[PDB]
Write a protein that binds this ligand. Structure first.
Ligand SMILES: O=C(CCCc1ccc2c(c1)CCCC2)N[C@@H]1O[C@H](CO)[C@@H](O)[C@H](O)[C@H]1O
Ligand SMILES: O=C(CCCc1ccc2c(c1)CCCC2)N[C@@H]1O[C@H](CO)[C@@H](O)[C@H](O)[C@H]1O
Lengths: 810, 810
């Protein structure tokens, strides 16, 4: 149908049809008489998978022949979403499979909906790793993603009586056709035990063993025949494990295998839980043995020339002392040489500044679980602090600030300090964030080793986040400027010369309208929800956290409602306000915020005076597959975190690429987005980082704002008095209390500017032609935010490898 | 190479080779450069599996079209062993696959050794179910085997310092290419809760739910294109199960899923464990929903015309009250009509007379776990006892003897009594056993309902137990009498006319010699054990139990040793005595017996005066795949249980078919074997059942035998004094104590007759020609012991269906 979806050749369509029937018969053991749509999905997935394997085998053979420097991206999260469509896109098979399935009497889009998300992440950090894998393959890098194969990913969210309920995400129930188990590369991982000192060095003995079994998933590059590997480890008990009586010993194997059972959902809130530490060591120990094995199958002086390890936050930070352990205790390198190799091999990416998100492990846990690692960490600390002392003599305060060991009630190890000490590069994820790291929380480290500190502004893959989710937009762009922009997104700048083209303006607006109709219908179908598709689609989707300020959005929604009720016969631009996202199960305030949003909906959506002028919908179970639907449909993207709190953001970039305008604070990557598009083409409001600092110096007093802004006072009185919870009038008292007395994120301080900025949005939306022209200026300048640009920068400035756009042969 | 292995056509060999390469590439994702022998095994298994699926689909379609009466064989155990060779045999593919793999530079026999046993049983009962499935498919019956997919089957046995050690049988580690998961036919199973009585009947409410997910394995008939199904259930937690905190709730899913984790290994010893009861109900509840679903997809008056349920012992006895529950509580049939349907549907096979093997569940367990079933069982009991009272008025003792409820310290339900009450047929498994049931333990029931009681003498499948394991013997037989005997084993009688044929005599003896050389070499290869292949191979393999009297064998071994030491320069027929089998992990006496056997080996095998005249070897990890190797190599089969204790035996039949002579008591099927071959062609010794009864009446006094038999006294003095355990002189005191004071199985009473009979064996073995002639007379009369004969009898006399030997079309 559309050109960017590739060719449907007679030969290709014929071959796909016959391979589909082969799999249905031999693989699934069904015939057309009893087959369900799920059977048909699986037959298609196996058919597409067959096209990967030749390229997969020869890519890995190629790396063996050429022996390039290998990049190892270590992460506890890979938020991959669905794989079928992505694979078809990257292999140029979409139109062919569409034709083939159509000729079999099947609708491919219906089959696509059957696949489960691989929801092995919480949000931005996990999704970044997934975008990165796609870009690394597209740029021809010899890259491997390493993580954990969780049996249960991020929970499925149900809303019952306006409250979040969690259920287990049993994503593997029907099988996963994309992975290949590799039980033959199973490796042992050690826990507990004790350290013995011999004449011939230290020995870690009397350990418990858990096995790490790998599962490999292919990662196809865009139309270059490169297929890289994501290797995820699964925990297995050894067969003599624990070996009445006999029965209980077999049942107790679950203790070991629980390591890979479930993803922790409490993102941005560190807890010192033993099981989480076991997960972190498990991925690190198995991965490093795999790395060393592959390196030997070609003297460790050359190790950093052949290996780069990228740490996705501190979660895999134990790689540093584990590499030292292996080099010193097993390979018998002297300490100094091992440390040189380690530093040159490892690099660390920081993704947070909130103090409660930093990993600070109690020493007593490390002592029991990983006694040799604690010893190595103490030794690293002593040598590092000796360097600090020599560079800043007499500065005893600096010594305690920079220590890897935190003194206090409970002694803790600061894993961020360990990563900085043990890495040759440390980066933040947007310019403002990287500057904040050097000026505040890692100031001391920057003063000691300025050369370590870099910026790598985040990005998103334009394959999933434009071609896959918004083919209509991809097509009208390709009509004007060709197809090359899909792997060179800076070419979108060429669209500036169409900002006054009447045909293009109409097509851009038509594509948005079609997306909005499609989404409005999805809403009715799957959730009996009933929206006006002519309204402005005002969308805030991301995890629920106080710093992200879903509450500020709520205050605006109630302001609009109150204004309508005050002057009901006045014209207002109609809106559909959609808020979505998961709350961490133990985060009470986040759970109350979800309840508030649904409670506002209950009042607003049933008030006959409002009509269809305002609707408030909570988008249930926000995840990658839902993002692919709602983002192309959005008019307005809400990026309204308190300045200094969102390290980068990546949802922001997805909305920009798909034709929404942005209302946002000067936080994270919003700053660079506004800089690229022009501030006149962005709806910027609120305190800058400098203003937040000034307020903190004086002291934030929320009462001052309540006293001076009558519209705000009205809302607080409504919340307090039970207007939004008539049967339980005190329901939202915790929210009101926090807002008035303990608000770390200064919701009231940006309220007035936010409401005024929202008025300017509504004014522009009344003039469709000028709205759309501003959209074109956003899409056209979104090129910097391709993860291909990001990865090219990691490759040249951190890993020391050159990207390539050249095809491997088919 | 050999004719019974089928044709190696050019077209077939070419197609197999290309499909093998296809699977290696696309299925396994390997190439010839990195492939291991395990990869090659899997490529072959997938290639052979492809040949099953067409026949599997069309067999099941055929049953849907014709709607024949369906046979459901319910068992907690299916001891299947390996599947690759069996599949090749039944599909006539063995020579073709041999040729194909040879042309690829691979040895097929080496690849066969890589497959794990499906060890989902303990011994005879589990293996009988497997032989039965093979015969039911071969006889064209619409039969389904239903059981539990244990994650861990019978433990792997290691011997360390002469002691049994257990390790988990992780048989699914590398995957199982034969099974097909069917998550779409998942069914709920209920536990706990309570019963509510409404006006509209009883209701079972407030239950915990566990899901039963089926996995289907194909069961091919012999060269008839029938492929039946074995459906095994796996336990899964529902996704809201139990739904910090959140993490613990996800980890606690293991509680539910433990139901299918592990096979209980304590055969012949009943324990009232809750988990075992859960397993029993799980298989019954899921299976019966499946049965009813299939019946409706065509009024319950016709249910027994379309359904037969065979209970493999009492382990699935809850089928009776579950069927009543469904018919009465859910389908709203009146009690009497439901009971009529149930009785006509169900039939029960008894496999034991030892009292400690009978299932007698504490009422308090049923009360908590299955409260509605207990109510139904009480109601069944009251109505049954009312019939007993009317037939035998005033006989109050009979009422308490026949009750399903056993009064005492703890009240118990006798599941055997429940099965007899609720079944239209009850059978034993050999003539003597079925007679014992009517005369002793079920005498009262036989007097009430004589028509229910039948015999069905056990059998073994001649596919696995001759063609597969002993192709050399199968071939020399086929040369004389053709191939038809493989599915009509009575044709072996034709071999009687070759008992004086010099060519045949030589070939029979040559085949045995080759088998013995092959096994002697397997022993050296895999266990550094070093045997004389000219010796008589004297073999006792079966689970270790006091009733089976491995101890009697031990006493003979020590007698032979002592006789040699007494007259070392006298000639004796050389022997290799092999004993093998697993002991239940908590059965102390069985564990001591294994230790005694290895301890005797330690002395005998290193005594220079003995030389190679006597060797004693303990065969480690006895299982189906090992039976297939040792049985074809055996000269003498030890079947020496105390008369009245072995219900049938089936190992006995395997040895007879493969050219070993039998030394045995008149117990179980030995009686019928001797009757078929002629007592003159069997080595029968010892007390008959009647003699054991006479001894019990007088009182068994072991001291009497010790006092009168000097050779026996010598052995007991050697055991007691530490001759076989010099560093631990009191090691075997428990054994000596049991033998002298508490021997339920009268080992001493058969000692003298056993030793004398063994002398007659040695005399015959000195005359190879006459030994071999007696062998031919055994092989020639083994036809009755085909499980095809057994199943034909179940079909006609219990299930009411006619067997068929007719092909389905290919
Ligand atoms: O997600 C994170 C920080 C990870 C924090 C964290 C802390 C503790 C725990 C988790 C995650 C996961 C569960 C266990 C405990 N940062 C986000 O990274 C995105 C990609 O760089 C960035 O766009 C977001 O601004 C930043 O909040
Ligand atoms: O295996 C059995 C009885 C099953 C007894 C039993 C009792 C309790 C438990 C089990 C088995 C399995 C573990 C849980 C507790 N009988 C054998 O059946 C063979 C096939 O009919 C027959 O040849 C053997 O003589 C008979 O001992």
């Amino acid at each position: 149908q559309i050109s960017v979806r590739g060719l449907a050749g007679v030969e290709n369509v014929t071959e796909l049809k016959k391979n589909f029937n082969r799999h249905l018969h031999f693989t699934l053991v069904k015939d057309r008489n009893v087959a369900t749509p799920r059977d048909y999905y699986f037959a298609l997935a196996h058919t597409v998978r067959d096209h990967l394997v030749g390229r997969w085998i020869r890519t890995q053979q190629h790396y063996y022949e050429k022996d390039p420097k290998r990049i190892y991206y270590l992460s506890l999260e890979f938020y991959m979403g669905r794989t079928l469509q992505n694979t078809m896109v990257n292999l140029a098979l979409e139109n062919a499979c569409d034709e083939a399935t159509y000729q079999l009497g099947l609708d491919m889009e219906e089959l696509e909906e059957i696949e489960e998300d691989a929801g092995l992440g919480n949000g931005g950090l996990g999704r970044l790793a997934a975008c990165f894998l796609d870009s690394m393959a597209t740029l021809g890098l010899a890259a491997y993603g390493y993580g954990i194969r969780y049996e249960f990913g991020i929970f499925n969210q149900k809303i019952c009586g306006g409250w979040q309920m969690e259920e287990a995400d049993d994503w593997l129930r029907y099988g996963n056709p994309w992975e290949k188990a590799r039980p033959e590369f199973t490796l042992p991982v050690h826990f507990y035990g004790r350290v013995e000192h011999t004449s011939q060095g230290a020995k870690w003995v009397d350990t418990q063993v858990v096995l790490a079994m790998p599962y490999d998933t292919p990662v196809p590059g865009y139309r270059n025949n490169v297929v890289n590997t994501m290797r995820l480890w699964s925990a297995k008990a050894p067969n003599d494990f624990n070996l009445g009586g006999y029965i209980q010993a077999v049942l107790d194997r679950n203790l070991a295998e629980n390591i890979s059972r479930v993803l922790y959902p409490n993102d941005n809130f560190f807890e010192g839980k033993e099981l989480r530490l076991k997960q972190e060591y498990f991925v690190v120990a198995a991965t490093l043995q795999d790395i060393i094995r592959r390196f030997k199958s070609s003297n460790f002086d050359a190790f950093p020339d052949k290996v780069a390890i990228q740490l996705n936050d501190t979660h895999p930070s134990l790689a540093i002392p584990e590499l030292m352990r292996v080099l010193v205790d097993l390979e018998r390198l002297d300490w100094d040489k091992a440390w040189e190799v380690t530093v040159k091999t490892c690099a660390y990416t920081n993704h947070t500044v909130l103090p409660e998100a930093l990993e600070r492990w109690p020493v007593h846990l490390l002592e029991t679980l990983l006694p040799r690692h604690l010893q190595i960490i103490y030794e690293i600390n002593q040598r590092f602090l000796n360097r600090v002392a020599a560079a800043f003599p007499g500065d005893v305060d600096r010594l305690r600030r920079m220590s890897l060991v935190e003194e206090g009630a409970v002694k803790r190890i600061n894993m961020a300090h360990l990563c900085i000490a043990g890495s040759h590069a440390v980066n933040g994820v947007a310019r403002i964030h990287s500057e904040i790291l050097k000026k505040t929380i890692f100031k001391d480290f920057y003063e000691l080793e300025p050369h370590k500190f870099q910026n790598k502004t985040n990005g998103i893959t334009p394959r999933r986040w434009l071609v896959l989710c918004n083919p209509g937009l991809a097509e009208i762009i390709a009509e004007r400027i060709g197809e090359e922009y899909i792997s060179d997104l800076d070419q979108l700048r060429k669209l500036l010369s169409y900002v006054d083209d009447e045909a293009f303006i109409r097509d851009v607006a038509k594509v948005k309208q079609e997306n909005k109709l499609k989404f409005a219908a999805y809403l009715e179908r799957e959730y009996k929800v009933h929206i006006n598709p002519n309204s402005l689609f005002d969308v805030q989707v991301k995890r629920i956290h106080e710093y992200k300020r879903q509450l500020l959005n709520c205050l605006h929604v109630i302001t609009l409602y109150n204004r309508i009720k005050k002057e009901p016969n006045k014209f207002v631009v109609p809106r559909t306000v959609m808020i979505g996202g998961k709350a961490a199960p133990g985060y009470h305030m986040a759970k109350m915020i979800i309840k508030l949003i649904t409670a506002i909906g209950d009042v607003v959506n049933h008030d006959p005076v409002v009509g269809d002028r305002l609707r408030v919908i909570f988008l249930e179970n926000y995840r990658v597959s839902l993002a692919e639907k709602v983002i192309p449909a959005a008019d307005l993207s809400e990026q309204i975190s308190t300045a200094g709190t969102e390290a980068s953001g990546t949802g922001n970039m997805k909305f920009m690429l798909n034709g929404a305008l942005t209302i946002g604070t000067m936080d994270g990557a919003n700053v660079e987005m506004a800089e690229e598009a022009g501030e006149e083409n962005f709806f910027i409001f609120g305190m800058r980082v400098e203003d937040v600092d000034r307020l903190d110096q004086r002291g934030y007093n929320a009462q001052e704002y309540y006293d001076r802004i009558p519209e705000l006072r009205q809302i607080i009185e409504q919340l307090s008095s039970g207007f939004f919870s008539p049967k339980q009038p005190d329901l939202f008292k915790d929210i009101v209390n926090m807002l008035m007395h303990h608000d770390r994120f200064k919701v009231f301080a940006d309220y007035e500017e936010y409401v005024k900025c929202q008025e300017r949005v509504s004014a522009l939306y009344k003039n469709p032609r000028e709205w759309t022209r501003m959209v074109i200026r956003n899409i056209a300048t979104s090129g910097k935010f391709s993860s291909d640009r990001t990865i090219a920068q990691y490759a040249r400035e951190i890993w020391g490898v050159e990207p390539s756009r050249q095809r491997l042969p088919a």
